[PDB]
Symmetry: C3
């Protein structure tokens, strides 16, 4: 009965000489995301949505392999007494084509959250050529999570 929702936002710059890692998937591409960690923009947004659902603050309060961060986030959410019910998310990127990699992202997140595949979703959008996202200056992710307090 004790359901809670969270939401998460993250953006990183796209620079050359970094490998591209979104949703724990290394995607072949001539640029990658810039950050202190591996800068996995999708995992960061999801981590934030989970801490938010559980009212545990945010990713900078708590915390690098972003999958390990995601698993520790999930561990702390479980320790606060919440079970995760579902995750949805959107990646907004001009390039590259993310469709061939989506199911793999979905699978990594399921694994890290200990959820079946059917409770995790990843969507991909272009920004229709508008703003810094449209110019391919960075990649944004958005996330939503529903949890319930056991």
């Amino acid at each position: 009965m004790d359901f809670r929702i969270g939401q998460g936002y993250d953006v990183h710059q796209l620079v050359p000489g970094r490998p591209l890692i979104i949703g724990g998937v290394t995607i072949p591409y001539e640029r990658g995301l810039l950050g202190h960690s591996d800068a996995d923009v999708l995992l960061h947004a999801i981590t934030d949505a989970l801490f938010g659902a559980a009212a545990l603050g945010d990713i900078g309060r708590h915390f690098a392999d972003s999958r390990a961060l995601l698993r520790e986030c999930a561990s702390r959410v479980a320790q606060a007494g919440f079970a995760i019910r579902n995750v949805d998310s959107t990646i907004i990127a001009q390039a590259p084509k993310l469709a061939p990699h989506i199911d793999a992202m979905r699978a990594n997140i399921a694994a890290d959250l200990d959820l079946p595949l059917d409770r995790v979703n990843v969507k991909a959008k272009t920004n229709e050529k508008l703003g810094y996202l449209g110019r391919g200056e960075g990649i944004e992710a958005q996330a939503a999570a529903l949890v319930v307090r056991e």
Copy 2:
């Protein structure tokens, strides 16, 4: 009971010689959306696929027909739609007097009562491509239950 949430995002450019169509409503305006490029129905569509964990709009496919088909697929995965909430971000034109008709369009397409469908509008305070009137963005959130 087995609740799930989804979230949707869409943006489209504003261009000359296109009708402005948002939430199924034709709004008098010098320019319209490129793509019927209905940004609001697209966001809601993605929010619903996301909640049912069915992927996204481009993995599946006018916008009202597509919103109807999304609803069909959501029910096919065995979910009922509980509510939809959404925001349109447009510097111009004024959307307020069309919002109720958008809600009515959406409620009909999703076979939902009016009180389970919401549409909100914001400017972007003259900031960015939104503030300059170069595009219109929509955001949506959807709650479903596996019945």
Copy 3:
């Protein structure tokens, strides 16, 4: 029972000559938001009206905290109890972490929630766009309610 979700978005310009007020907290900074222009409370207000399918902040509507209290009252009177709120402030500067618990406390008090049902997060924009250049501040909110 009858759960519903709302989402909210808000943005304001950051200029000198205005004080910075986010989540009801006055934050010392060379610049502030143009509108009391409380970007966080506006977004949360929008998210609550959205969950209750009551339109948006402009249709209903004093400082932003009284507006939030009136919002919650109307949400109650519509048959809904607030279950939780989560949110994100996106600002390149200044550092918001020290002010987070104050913001949560104001929101919780205004909604009559226990603190552990209100969350506020902070993010930079990695120096991208008008947000990353310190030209505005954005807030996003999600609200869960039940009838």
